[PDB]
Symmetry: D3
Subunit: 173 residues, 6 copies
Amino acid sequence: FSNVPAGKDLPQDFNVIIEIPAQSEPVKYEADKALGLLVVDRFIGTGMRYPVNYGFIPQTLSGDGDPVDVLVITPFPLLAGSVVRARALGMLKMTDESGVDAKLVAVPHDKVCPMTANLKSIDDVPAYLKDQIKHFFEQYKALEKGKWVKVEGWDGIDAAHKEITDGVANFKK
Amino acid sequence: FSNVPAGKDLPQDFNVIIEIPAQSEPVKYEADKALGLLVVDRFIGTGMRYPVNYGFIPQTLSGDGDPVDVLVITPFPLLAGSVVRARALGMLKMTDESGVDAKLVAVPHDKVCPMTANLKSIDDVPAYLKDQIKHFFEQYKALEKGKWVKVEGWDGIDAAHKEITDGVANFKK
Amino acid sequence: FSNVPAGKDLPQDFNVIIEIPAQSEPVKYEADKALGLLVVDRFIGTGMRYPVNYGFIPQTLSGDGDPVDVLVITPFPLLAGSVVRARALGMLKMTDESGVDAKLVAVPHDKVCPMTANLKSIDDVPAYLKDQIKHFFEQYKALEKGKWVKVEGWDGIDAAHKEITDGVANFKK
Amino acid sequence: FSNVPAGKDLPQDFNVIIEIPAQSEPVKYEADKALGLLVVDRFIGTGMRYPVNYGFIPQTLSGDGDPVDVLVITPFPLLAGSVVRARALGMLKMTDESGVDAKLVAVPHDKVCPMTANLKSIDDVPAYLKDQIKHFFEQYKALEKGKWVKVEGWDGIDAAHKEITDGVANFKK
Amino acid sequence: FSNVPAGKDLPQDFNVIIEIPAQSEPVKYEADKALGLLVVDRFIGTGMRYPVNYGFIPQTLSGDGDPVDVLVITPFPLLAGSVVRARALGMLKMTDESGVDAKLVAVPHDKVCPMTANLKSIDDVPAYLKDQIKHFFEQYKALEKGKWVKVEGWDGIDAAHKEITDGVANFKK
Amino acid sequence: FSNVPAGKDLPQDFNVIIEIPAQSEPVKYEADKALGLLVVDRFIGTGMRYPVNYGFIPQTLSGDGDPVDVLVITPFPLLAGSVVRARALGMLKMTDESGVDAKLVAVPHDKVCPMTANLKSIDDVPAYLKDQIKHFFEQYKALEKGKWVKVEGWDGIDAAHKEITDGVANFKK
Ligand SMILES: c1ccc(NCc2cccnc2)cc1
Ligand SMILES: c1ccc(NCc2cccnc2)cc1
Ligand SMILES: c1ccc(NCc2cccnc2)cc1
Ligand SMILES: c1ccc(NCc2cccnc2)cc1
Ligand SMILES: c1ccc(NCc2cccnc2)cc1
Ligand SMILES: c1ccc(NCc2cccnc2)cc1
Ligand SMILES: c1ccc(NCc2cccnc2)cc1
Ligand SMILES: c1ccc(NCc2cccnc2)cc1
Ligand SMILES: c1ccc(NCc2cccnc2)cc1
């Protein structure tokens, strides 16, 4: 993982390593860059499943000390541990008991997934799905004692790119 | 459906027709007794899945006008539309925007499922699972506008049997 | 099957009994109304899978002697043998070695599937999917000796409703 | 179930109602002809799965009091509760604690499944699979206390047809 | 694989790399530490599936020349090739045609899987499952000519830890 | 990937790294040898699935600049990213808009998969399957604008081995 480039053309053309496929059984994996393996992190107490694929941009460091994380919408779930070339639609702003958290929302490169080319920004994402994603983050850790998540709202591509820009910078010191 | 007996020996030995398997994709089916078919009722807005199998006791009529409904815990999900001989462990008491709702909690007959014979009452059901079920009912209809569910708590086998007793009585007028 | 109503309000509000779920393994089932069971019709030589759910309107008789058939787009595949309340978006016009064939394109009632409410007519169906459906019909029977299918194009809701109207009429003699 | 014909042309052209798909999770279902539903019979103690589809010929009565049962080899598992038009390859002779048991081995009609047309008799069935089936019957009930199964060997199409012939006769009194 | 630590705190807190998920299709994989890939070892003649997840402790060498192997009980199967932080419940003692074989029985760290925290020792593992595991090992290689497995019985956490202790020692020469 | 040997005994005994399992959802992955990861290449416009497992021989370079690719027939799909020891049955000759393309057809080593040992050459592969594979290649890229594939026919083990021989040579310069 630690040698996969952050992107062909940052911040708009970036790579995402998938950790949790959309609709997978409710087990959270986290990539160990140090090992090149997915690690079983948690069996989700609520047993709720990610509504979209979940992963990270390698060679990034967000303020929380982990890589920039990303939700990638696709017509079929992606393989855990695989890498996909992606583009941003925006971000979901949240705060939990430890501080700010933001998850980017992305889709594959148009050449990879023509099915998603019509999605130009976060607002093109179907209402039911944005609502579903918001609900997921608000509730999935409900049975993890000591934890809480509050969703603040959505932001656009600019904000997503800033997040990418900074994470790439921080990672290099 | 309308000719399947409520039970071999009511209220302790009863039958459950399965409508929604544990962990099935988030689509709610409802049996049409008049037709002998499962009907697509709703695509669940939250996309949350039933943590246990869900069905009903045929030839019962609860106060809400539908048959007595039941959660049936099994080691592998049951086939939608199949029937299972069951025994009660208790009930989950709830109220929603339309009034009282109670869902029985059951397991298969010991001869059918030896794996569940150790469960004698609701208290033997693992904490994580009862918590998971409570959370599911509190949140699954969160994105159905106009709807709400509040979970009151659990009750034992006596209460479950009363519910069966009355539903069987009401159904016969 | 033979007692399930064609629809609550024909031709715009109709019922579809599902025979083949979207993306199911490549085995064609056909409902036997006389028996109330799905019959294994054919293992598809090309092994191609239906890109959308496939079924029929009960109590209809199309000119080809079978019920009016329908493709039903949903976010998760529907259960074979289940029934869904649907509305039409249009039709796919085709001809095969035996004559005209038309398949309606439908989605569930808005109350059943909010995810599809945005689809008002055939033109709202994503390009990639219409193309995918056209390709499927043109090729799926490619390895059935003696058979061929040619796709003529799409038509709108009016045409779909006429097809429903006539099939309902014919079925009653 | 009780109205599905035993066959279009007995004993060589017969119908099989599927109860347990090949490779399904290890739950035994049994069709209730009286109800027209599949009943959960047993969660298999060994958790072993049927290596081929398992069902019965309707309107037959074998000496053991149940319908003639049949293993149906197909390239993809069949839907539980569906019906398939079949032809026999032979039988597996067995005895258990209750007496003789014989399971026919069948494949779909050549027009249904071209993939199986090459199988003319039991000897054309791959060695590994016959061995696998024999092992399954010898071991699957190993953890059902009081039960045992001994496999005697295989027999051909004649024997299979006799079994069909008699079961059809007995069923009619 | 060869750089994943044996454990955070040996022998009680160790790591397991998963090779075969619970209930996966009957194909045996073996991790190639030299390559960092899972290798297709065998299609199991009996077609029996592992009842629990199966893997190994990296950087261990058992007396048989392979790493210490482990069965890891979880509520949903784990991803092949993933790593899980685990704790031992005991061991299953066996002998096959090549000599002693022992498989540890483990569960994830309590923080990873709260669902398993109630299991303190091998005796807390449900009877049906221990029986199922014993049966699996006794029979799964039944159709591998030249091979046999005899199960001797179970042992506790002490024995499991000794096995870990020695394998870690041997691996380092 | 780049360190996995081409084979134990080239050209007849070789290794195949699997990229796309038989019957997987229609997403094309390509191994990045430089990274040791599978990359999402394309969501297949036709949504057609590989009828057999698809992968490549590592440390080979075909004339088209990519490694020698191989279809591997197995009784259950193989894990993406896994490696299997294989033997050739022949090849499928094709041309597309960019030039010659040939895909080898292989099965696992007899010791790995006894189920396939009966297949000695391409002609032993069932007709329906060869036809299915030919159809797949002729049609799967039908909705990739600018692309086309024409299937020329099949060739035997000699031709397959030549392809292996040359790819191994080219890779080493
Ligand atoms: C949540 C996550 C993924 C999907 N996938 C459906 C989809 C995506 C893109 C284009 N066409 C169809 C749906 C909901
Ligand atoms: C929710 C619903 C069903 C299960 N099934 C697991 C189970 C049930 C009974 C006995 N042994 C294992 C688990 C959670
Ligand atoms: C719901 C009901 C019972 C259980 N039983 C716990 C359990 C542990 C290990 C194996 N199998 C089962 C779990 C969920
Ligand atoms: C073909 C058939 C069904 C789908 N389902 C995806 C879908 C449908 C409706 C609304 N949102 C997402 C996609 C392609
Ligand atoms: C068929 C019909 C509608 C769609 N809707 C596109 C879509 C994008 C993202 C999430 N969900 C759905 C896709 C296929
Ligand atoms: C056991 C049961 C079914 C199968 N199906 C594979 C198969 C069957 C017929 C023709 N071609 C391939 C294999 C083993
Ligand atoms: C049961 C019956 C027939 C077969 N047929 C063998 C086979 C080889 C390659 C592809 N498809 C089928 C296998 C199992
Ligand atoms: C065999 C292997 C795993 C399971 N998983 C069920 C389970 C495990 C732990 C806690 N709750 C439920 C069951 C049997
Ligand atoms: C296409 C690809 C794989 C299969 N697998 C079935 C099979 C293979 C070998 C031996 N026995 C049965 C069938 C068609």
